[PDB]
From a paper:
Here, we report the selection of [name] recognizing [name], one of the brightest and most photostable FPs in the blue-green spectrum. We characterized these binders both biochemically and biophysically and determined the three-dimensional structure of one [name]-[name] complex. The two [name] we report here bind specifically and with high affinity to [name].
The complex with [name] 1238_G01 did not crystallize, but the structure of both isolated [name] was determined as well (1238_G01, 1.6 Å resolution, R/Rfree of 16/18) and (1238_E11, 2.1 Å resolution, R/Rfree of 17/21). For [name] 1238_E11, a high affinity with an equilibrium dissociation constant (KD) value of 3 nM was determined, while the affinity of 1238_G01 was found to be lower with a value of ∼88 nM. Similarly, upon [name] binding, [name] remains structurally unchanged and exhibits only minor differences in the N-Cap region (Cα r.m.s.d. of 0.45 Å). Comparison to the crystal structures of the individual proteins showed no significant structural changes for both proteins upon complex formation. Anti-[name] [name] and [name] 1238_G01 differ in 13 out of 21 selected library residues, suggesting alternative binding epitopes, in line with the ELISA experiments.
Numbering used by the authors: 14 to 176
């Protein structure tokens, strides 16, 4: 319990050596903080690639959901961490996971303007027609935020899917 708390703190802070020390001493790799986030959540969100990699290699739950229903892939998509998105997907991240209001990682990547992540997600089977609880698709969010390059890529994928 104490090691897990320290592991969470180390993962958030990007302290690679502390993370490994704690893991080598039995720290629960899937420990959760007060909002249900795991070391993998925090390292993925903050862009700490090496910590993500060691966590995944050692068996961390790639699709753990926090209290908001967001997964590590959601979080990497939010902050635009492309290489982390790729390793998460290779480790089995659910490309179409939905948080508590129905948002998928594609929603987040489209809204927050991360074009490359959008393309990678689509390539891994992201649902271009996914609607959140308010009926918004990723395309709607790109349009709402004036992310026109992303909107075009999403339109292309939808036109392919519609054939």
């Amino acid at each position: 319990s104490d090691l897990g708390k320290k592991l969470l703190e180390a993962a958030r802070a990007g302290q690679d050596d502390e993370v490994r020390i704690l893991m080598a001493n039995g720290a629960d790799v899937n420990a959760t903080d007060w909002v249900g986030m795991t070391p993998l959540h925090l390292a993925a969100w903050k862009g700490h690639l090496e910590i993500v990699e060691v966590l995944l290699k050692t068996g961390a739950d790639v699709n753990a959901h926090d209290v908001f229903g967001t997964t590590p892939l959601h979080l990497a998509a939010h902050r635009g961490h492309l290489e982390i998105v790729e390793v998460l997907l290779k480790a089995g991240a659910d490309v179409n996971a939905q948080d508590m209001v129905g948002k998928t990682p594609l929603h987040l990547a489209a809204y927050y303007g991360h074009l490359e992540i959008v393309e990678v997600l689509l390539k891994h089977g992201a649902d271009v027609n996914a609607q959140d609880k308010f009926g918004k698709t990723p395309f709607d969010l790109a349009i709402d935020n004036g992310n026109e390059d992303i909107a075009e890529v999403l339109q292309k994928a939808a036109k392919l899917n519609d054939y």
